[PDB]
Structure 1
């Protein structure tokens, strides 16, 4: 839906306007979970090859953990940027069309007559 928007670069993973956003924490819970999945991938790989699950290939286990965190950080940056753009467009569109989004003056419950439904 957003692909044809103004100022859209083709096949750009991280547009330069994304550098105004705060970067994710390196201990972001989503990045901690990514590294945990990489650790599980290493253990599952050991199991499938009939190796000692925790002991074998700590170098292979470390690469699995680091790759998941490394990839996840940059993907999380791109996902943060796409959500920020979505809000930038939504609110900007709301301002250009104030007739489609009126401020609805709500009434207090002193004036509203809700029906009473007796429980019995």
Structure 2
């Protein structure tokens, strides 16, 4: 859902629903953490400094900033996908007539030659 109906408008993270549990040491977090390290490699390409890998130790600021913002950004990702599924399952339960079930068949299909 795009427009809020049950969720509170303008939230820092969620706060209305907190129970979901965020991912711990996820493969998704590692890629954002890799980009934080990658940003601390190409910064020495702009301002000409000796060695991209073994240069200035202000790289720790670049890794942490990508992790801290990324953790909050992925927390919203797990939240928004949950709400999207929650409203989907509630739509089937309340209406029932919109959904139809079919199982087990013996229907003929056209066979291809050559």
TM-score scaled to structure 1, two decimals?
0.86
Q: CA–CA distance in 2 between the matches of 1:92 and 1:61? A: 47
TM-score with structure 2 setting the length: 0.90
Offset, 1:117 = 1.1
| Superposition pairs of residues 23-34 of structure 1, within 5 angstroms | 23-25=22-24, 27-34=25-32
Q: Which residue of 2 aligns with 1:14?
A: 13
The alignment partner of 1:16 has SS state of coil
Contact 1:13 1:78 in 2 (8 A): no
| TM-superposed deviation, 1:17 | 4.2
Which structure 1 residue ranges, 5 or more long, are not aligned? none
In 2, Cα distance between the equivalents of 1:33 and 1:102?
Answer: 41
Q: How many residues align?
A: 113
Counterpart for residue 43 of structure 1: 41
Secondary structure at the counterpart of residue 18 of structure 2: helix
Q: How far apart, in 2, do the equivalents of 1:8 and 1:84 lie? A: 12
Deviation, 1:4, is: 2.9
Please give the residue correspondences for 1:75-94 in structure 2 after superposition, counting only pairs within 5 Å.
75-94=73-92
The Cα shift of 1:8 comes to: 2.3
